[PDB]
Structure 1
Amino acid sequence: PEFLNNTEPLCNVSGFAIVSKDNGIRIGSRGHVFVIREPFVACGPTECRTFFLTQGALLNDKHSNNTVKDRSPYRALMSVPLGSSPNAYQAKFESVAWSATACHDGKKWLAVGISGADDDAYAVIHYGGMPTDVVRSWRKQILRTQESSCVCMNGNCYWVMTDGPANSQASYKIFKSHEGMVTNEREVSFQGGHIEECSCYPNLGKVECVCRDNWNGMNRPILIFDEDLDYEVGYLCAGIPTDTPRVQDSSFTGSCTNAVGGSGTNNYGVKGFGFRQGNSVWAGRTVSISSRSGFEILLIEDGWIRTSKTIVKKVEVLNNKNWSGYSGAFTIPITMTSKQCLVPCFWLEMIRGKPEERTSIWTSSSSTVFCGVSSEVPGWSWDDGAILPFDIDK
């Protein structure tokens, strides 16, 4: 076993094909399936796995009550093979966690899970299933991380964490690890900016991240760094906003440097992703501008380098009549594709229950997963498909 290089360029793709759908909530109507949220996908040398944060409870059980809540001592990071439901008997325990990231360095799985009190949380780093290191909260205000795959290159793994207020200036740090031990860290200077839940991927030896601004920006922060943790930080240049909530495209003017907000879009957001394509960008977003409803992906011409409004392609993978949620990025390594470039993929979370469906006592989500291909691919609507309310709701 050797470390994955992961220093190849990201593939240029013209479409995204569906790779997986777990149907977890449909199955959990009768089967034994965890209540979850914040699913994400990460790939090792031989397989991809779906990670998720459980609520330490099963669907259609009384312990699923009040699972709209984000943090508790019962949440854990677990994983299943890609496409499996997050069920009670296949789930592999990874970390105690109400916020997490995970990735594979070519030799072993790395998992970073945060638990503890809001004012004194800490991350536990697991490597090959063994606890190796700890990262303590440095601002004592809900230490939190990506909720998606971290990035490994040449035996080093990288991820981004945040600590501080949800709706004002916070603190943002990049971490570097080797075999589960933190070997470097760097605080990112981003005055007036806000970074949470970064979706990161490798591209030609650098880590490129598209994040969530939960403060004054309806545009997404972009963070790019190298092995030294030297970084560039700013916003996705595109004159098309991709956070939620946001305003209509015609009411928006892009910026590469500043958070663009107002119009009732401040103080919230949703985890999302984007992939640089030379000077252009593939960016995902909810179809609704106000709620987590529907999902589409847009190819914006020169959207990575200028405030372009030119949409070259648009593909819908979930219609606006269905609930979406978080979305995130990962890549498929060369050891699985035998290609000369890294394949960009994304996953989509579809949230059911509270708060949008008030007649249910619980909140969970299921997922779909898509990977980039060299040709155009039609869209459709692959919705969660569960029929609510459930038995436990009655």
Structure 2
Amino acid sequence: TYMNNTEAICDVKGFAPFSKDNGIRIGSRGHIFVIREPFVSCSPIECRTFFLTQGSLLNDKHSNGTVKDRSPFRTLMSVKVGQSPNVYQARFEAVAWSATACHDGKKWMTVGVTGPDSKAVAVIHYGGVPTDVINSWAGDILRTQESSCTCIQGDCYWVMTDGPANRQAQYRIYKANQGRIIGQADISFNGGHIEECSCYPNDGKVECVCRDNWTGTNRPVLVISPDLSYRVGYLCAGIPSDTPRGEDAQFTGSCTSPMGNQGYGVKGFGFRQGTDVWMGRTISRTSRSGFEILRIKNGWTQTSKEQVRKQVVVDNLNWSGYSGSFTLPVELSGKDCLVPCFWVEMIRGKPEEKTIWTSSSSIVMCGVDYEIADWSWHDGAILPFDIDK
């Protein structure tokens, strides 16, 4: 049975801890994949952490990170939410140096991108077998969300980028059913830049908060309808939620245009709350350290800088990184609405630390009806490791 997922995103006053995998502490002696870009998506039965592996294990010579990013060994694999990315509980998903995955209520669909940069291929798995393919349409690093894709009433949606990472590129919305592409759309967005979207369903449409790696310190936003007609632009709020970014005082919002005039970015997320928004970000304006989440009144729809709530989850003494959005299927939460959840990736090692390797653990949070006290569920690993000698 197909998951409806037409309900509205729940309105929430705070986020409770869902899980924490401690992969890297565990990785010190146990057998754990050196991973990167983990993310969470849910079936109507269990939620899973998906990730990308080098094929190498923590504390092993193959974790030498001279092994490139988009390498032929890179794969998408998965475990259950909370478990470390260990070999012995890992499920194979796809060959991928970039991925999205989501469940429609019947089976898991995953999309893994691999191949050469100039001519990459994106393979669609449905129920654990390839069912379809997308080739690079612009010849420049075909790539996708690295967070959950979105399924409504049996059709699954996601967003991909083919083009340069630091200037204008091209963007597309795909629609598959049972792992067959059944629709696509080009996205007009001259001046604007879209990378690594974080998406979720909301009122029978797909809402995304993405990454502008060209010029904007605000996050681009798009809203997709089942007919693949779309609206696109930026998160209106007069507060920047990208890294690097400038200061809140020296920032003017926009619903239409990049602002901030800064190059680089990071994957991040946001949830519509009526006309409010929960926007997450790192605490540092420049580095991937700390993580917090602000609620701005009328933020989804105006250049508001009115903060109604602020909750810290990783303190600014500790390393953060990527973060993304997903919902709890109604079939799991029991609510009549879609419970908004997010995960925060905590990167340890290169570039900031003196190890030959890089990986990340994770923490997962879900919307609750109460305020949650600030804390820091940070990574915990004690660097460097034996391998680093």
> If the TM-score is normalised by the length of the shorter chain, which range does it land in?
over 0.9
Kindly state the Cα deviation for residue 367 of structure 1 after the two structures are TM-superposed.
Answer: 0.3
The aligned counterpart of 1:350 is 346
The aligned counterpart of 2:277 is 281
The aligned counterpart of 2:175 is 176
What secondary structure does 1:368 align onto? Answer: strand
Q: Deviations over 1:133-177 (max 9, x none)?
A: 000000110000000000001100000000000000000000000
The aligned counterpart of 2:382 is 387
Q: Deviations over 1:331-353 (max 9, x none)?
A: 00111122210000000000000
Counterparts of 1:309-348 in structure 2, within 5 Å, are 309-348=305-344
Paired with 1:86 and 1:125, the residues of 2 have a C-alpha distance of 22
The percent identity for this pair of structures is 70
The aligned counterpart of 1:361 is 356
The aligned counterpart of 1:202 is 201
The aligned counterpart of 1:291 is 287
Paired with 1:295 and 1:337, the residues of 2 have a C-alpha distance of 25
**Structure 2 residue 366 is the aligned partner of structure 1 residue 371:** yes
Q: Structure 1's 67 and 275: CA in aligned 2 closer, same or farther, altered over 3 A?
A: farther
Kindly state the Cα deviation for residue 68 of structure 1 after the two structures are TM-superposed.
Answer: 7.4
Q: Flag structure 1 segments of 5+ consecutive residues without an equivalent.
A: none
Q: 1:180 is matched by which residue type in structure 2?
A: G
Contact 1:201 1:209 in 2 (8 A): yes
Q: Structure 1's 67 and 373: CA in aligned 2 closer, same or farther, altered over 3 A?
A: farther
Q: 2:85 is matched by which residue type in structure 1?
A: P
Paired with 2:164 and 2:388, the residues of 1 have a C-alpha distance of 34
Contact 1:68 1:354 in 2 (8 A): no
Q: 2:386 is matched by which residue type in structure 1?
A: D
The aligned counterpart of 2:211 is 212
Q: 2:14 is matched by which residue type in structure 1?
A: G
Paired with 1:51 and 1:68, the residues of 2 have a C-alpha distance of 21
TM-score, L = length of structure 1: 0.98
What secondary structure does 2:99 align onto? Answer: strand
What secondary structure does 2:118 align onto? Answer: coil
Q: 2:375 is matched by which residue type in structure 1?
A: W
Kindly state the Cα deviation for residue 50 of structure 1 after the two structures are TM-superposed.
Answer: 0.4
What secondary structure does 1:126 align onto? Answer: strand
Kindly state the Cα deviation for residue 67 of structure 1 after the two structures are TM-superposed.
Answer: 5.8
Kindly state the Cα deviation for residue 261 of structure 1 after the two structures are TM-superposed.
Answer: 2.3
**Structure 2 residue 117 is the aligned partner of structure 1 residue 118:** yes
Paired with 1:258 and 1:67, the residues of 2 have a C-alpha distance of 37
Paired with 1:75 and 1:28, the residues of 2 have a C-alpha distance of 19
Paired with 1:258 and 1:179, the residues of 2 have a C-alpha distance of 36
Contact 1:156 1:177 in 2 (8 A): yes
Q: 1:128 is matched by which residue type in structure 2?
A: G
Q: 1:10 is matched by which residue type in structure 2?
A: I
Q: 2:313 is matched by which residue type in structure 1?
A: V
Q: 1:384 is matched by which residue type in structure 2?
A: D
Q: Deviations over 1:274-312 (max 9, x none)?
A: 000000000000000001010000000101111111110
Contact 1:39 1:367 in 2 (8 A): yes
Q: Structure 1's 317 and 22: CA in aligned 2 closer, same or farther, altered over 3 A?
A: same
Deviating more after overlay: 65-74 vs 125-134: 65-74
Q: Structure 1's 329 and 179: CA in aligned 2 closer, same or farther, altered over 3 A?
A: same
**Structure 2 residue 54 is the aligned partner of structure 1 residue 40:** no
Kindly state the Cα deviation for residue 70 of structure 1 after the two structures are TM-superposed.
Answer: 2.0
What secondary structure does 1:364 align onto? Answer: strand
Kindly state the Cα deviation for residue 193 of structure 1 after the two structures are TM-superposed.
Answer: 0.3
The aligned counterpart of 2:98 is 99
Contact 1:350 1:367 in 2 (8 A): yes
Paired with 1:212 and 1:202, the residues of 2 have a C-alpha distance of 18
Paired with 1:342 and 1:85, the residues of 2 have a C-alpha distance of 26
**Structure 2 residue 16 is the aligned partner of structure 1 residue 17:** yes
Contact 1:196 1:211 in 2 (8 A): yes
Paired with 1:205 and 1:61, the residues of 2 have a C-alpha distance of 46
Paired with 2:102 and 2:67, the residues of 1 have a C-alpha distance of 27
TM-score, L = length of structure 2: 0.99
Kindly state the Cα deviation for residue 86 of structure 1 after the two structures are TM-superposed.
Answer: 0.1
TM-align CA RMSD: 0.7
Paired with 2:122 and 2:342, the residues of 1 have a C-alpha distance of 25
Q: Deviations over 1:220-264 (max 9, x none)?
A: 0001010011100000010100000000100111111110022xx
The aligned counterpart of 2:296 is 300
Deviating more after overlay: 186-195 vs 332-341: 332-341
- Kindly report structure 1 stretches of 4+ aligned residues shifted beyond 4 Å: none
Q: 1:371 is matched by which residue type in structure 2?
A: C
Paired with 1:385 and 1:189, the residues of 2 have a C-alpha distance of 43
Paired with 2:90 and 2:359, the residues of 1 have a C-alpha distance of 16
What secondary structure does 2:143 align onto? Answer: coil
What secondary structure does 1:19 align onto? Answer: strand
Q: 2:324 is matched by which residue type in structure 1?
A: G
Paired with 2:158 and 2:67, the residues of 1 have a C-alpha distance of 26
Q: Flag structure 2 segments of 5+ consecutive residues without an equivalent.
A: none
Q: Deviations over 1:60-111 (max 9, x none)?
A: 0000001674210111000001100000111000000000000000000000
